[PDB]
Paper text:
The ScLDM6×His [name] [name] mutant provides a surrogate X-ray crystal structure for the clinically relevant Darlington LDM mutant of C. albicans, and for the LDM Y131F I475T mutant from the phytopathogen P. pachyrhizi. Similar crystals of ScErg11p6×His [name] [name] in complex [name] VCZ formed after 20 days of incubation under a single experimental condition (46% PEG 400 pH 9.2). The VCZ in the double mutant showed the same configuration as in ScLDM6×His or ScLDM6×His [name] in complex [name] VCZ, but was slightly displaced towards H140 and more towards helix I (by ~0.7 Å) than in ScLDM6×His [name]. The structure of ScLDM6×His [name] [name] in complex [name] the VCZ structure also included a single water molecule, 3.6 Å from the tertiary alcohol of VCZ, that formed hydrogen bonds [name] the heme ring C propionate and a nitrogen of the histidine imidazole ring, but not VCZ. In contrast, both ScLDM6×His [name] and ScLDM6×His [name] [name] in complex [name] VCZ have no AO, but have an open SEC of a similar cross-sectional area at its narrowest point, i.e., the opening bounded by the M509 methyl and H381 imidazole nitrogen, and the F241 benzene ring and T511 sidechain methyl is ~48 Å2 for ScLDM6×His [name] in complex [name] VCZ, and ~49 Å2 for ScLDM6×His [name] [name] in complex [name] VCZ. The lower resolution (2.9 Å) of the ScLDM6×His [name] + [name] structure may have limited the observation of discrete structural changes, such as the location of key water molecules. In contrast, it was not apparent how the [name] and [name] mutations interact to confer preferential high-level resistance to the short-tailed azole VCZ, which appears to bind in the active site in comparable conformations in the [name] and [name] [name] enzymes. Unfortunately, the structures obtained do not elucidate how the [name] and [name] mutations interact to confer enhanced resistance to short-tailed azoles, i.e., the double mutation maintains enzyme function in the presence of the short-tailed triazole inhibitors FLC and VCZ.
Numbering used by the authors: 9 to 531
The structure:
Amino acid sequence: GEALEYVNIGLSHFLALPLAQRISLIIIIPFIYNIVWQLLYSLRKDRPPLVFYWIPWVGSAVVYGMKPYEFFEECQKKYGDIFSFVLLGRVMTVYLGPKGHEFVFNAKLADVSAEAAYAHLTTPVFGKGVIHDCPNSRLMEQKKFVKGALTKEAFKSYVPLIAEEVYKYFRDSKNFRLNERTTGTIDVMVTQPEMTIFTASRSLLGKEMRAKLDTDFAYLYSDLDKGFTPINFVFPNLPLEHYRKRDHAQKAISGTYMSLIKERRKNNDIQDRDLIDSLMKNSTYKDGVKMTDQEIANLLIGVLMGGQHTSAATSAWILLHLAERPDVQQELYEEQMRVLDGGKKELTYDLLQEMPLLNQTIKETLRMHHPLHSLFRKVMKDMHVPNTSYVIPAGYHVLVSPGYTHLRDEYFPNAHQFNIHRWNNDSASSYSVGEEVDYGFGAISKGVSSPYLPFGGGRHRCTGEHFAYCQLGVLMSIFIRTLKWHYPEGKTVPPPDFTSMVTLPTGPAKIIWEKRNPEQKIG
Ligand code: HEM
Ligand SMILES: C[C@@H](c1ncncc1F)[C@](O)(Cn1cncn1)c1ccc(F)cc1F
């Protein structure tokens, strides 16, 4: 009773402490509070173990962002395959391994949302109305629109254009100019992004859109390029300047696409050339709405942008791994001479399919260097993980990471050794190992239990797998037949830089190239 007066009294003296002790208690009450909250949380047996952190809110973000596969391995040894950690205000429950791939890539639409996790990151860059700034059902239909331009007949015609672009680059780039140099050094992280965007542009976007890249316009891609960073997860729209040249470039680049979209319909200049022709002819949803010309341009940005960063990272890794392995280059070259009749057969999408060792090299690189170490979903409903007393409460996030499983000896013997022969009689981009399902964009595998899942699975599954292998196929067939490359003295494979949007190599990652035929000229 008389004590009740003194909780009151003490509350008044609390308010009248010096700014030195108030400030410090501002930073000790929450620190001491979250340490004692965690301790209570670990007695909850319907929750997966939460890994201890000191700083509240920040959580474990520092070690997760820097070495996420080392973090995952350390957590796996302590608490098994399921565990939570807090990440800059959110709570992520990792499910490692194939049962984890299944728990997350085959989750019900009712249980998890990818849109809910990524809309803050994608929509500022791509524009609105597409990808994650729409309902999952719109997403499924957009993928059906894009995927309707990623056919075998499309792929037969992209191969001469892609190959033209590779040669034009060897001819004209300051990094090569093969008609004036026979040897040189390139930074793969400078060359590979440029090659990707040229080849992707010319093929999917058309010749006009490829043409604009030879000009100043190219910088808008570079400006747009920088708004695609995990920082948009914390400060999505933060009134600074790289946020404006980002948005400037979005408006600017989406304008060029609509200008072309609009003039093509004005002229009925609508053929089967590029994905711009395709999305024009076929972008009406199942309920009857057509995509606005701006929505078509923003899907263009998002598709080109995402495939840009994964494809460019992958050919970088193919070069860096091969730079160290002249025996694999020798092997890949023999297959080039055998399949292409010593160079006296033009490269075709068909002939690419007969090059298993090349396709096995892409396959193996993508095993060791998955471009997305972590995929996320926001949990919408309380989720129960079977064989288990755990519930993942709504508002948590689930995190699948097949790239970690990729690097496990459990599923890949000597997982840390680059070995393309681990895929003998198995050069497939991927393989639907049984029964299939359709979420709107075509029949894809129903199970998602494979330990090798470079293109994920389920509804959010990649619709650019076959394009990626095409691009990477021509690019690497031509690199192989034209150049030998090795590392500078002392140099080896760089470690991955996980902090960016894709695990790309820690730069600079340089290789010395030599012409196989010094006296050869590109016409
Ligand atoms: C080496 C190349 C690529 C790799 C390794 C890769 C990997 C992936 C993965 C793992 C996902 C699943 C995302 C998630 O589950 O959260 C995905 C989604 C997707 N990717 Fe790719 N990707 C590649 C290239 C491309 C290209 C070139 C395109 C376009 C031509 C593309 C378009 C898409 C689309 C449209 C989705 C659907 C996302 C969704 O439905 O939520 N990707 N990709
Ligand atoms: C959202 C994005 C992503 N980026 C980084 N970490 C996780 C991610 F989910 C991604 O899934 C990645 N991606 C897959 N293939 C190409 N890019 C994506 C999907 C569709 C798209 F049109 C553009 C795009 F970037």
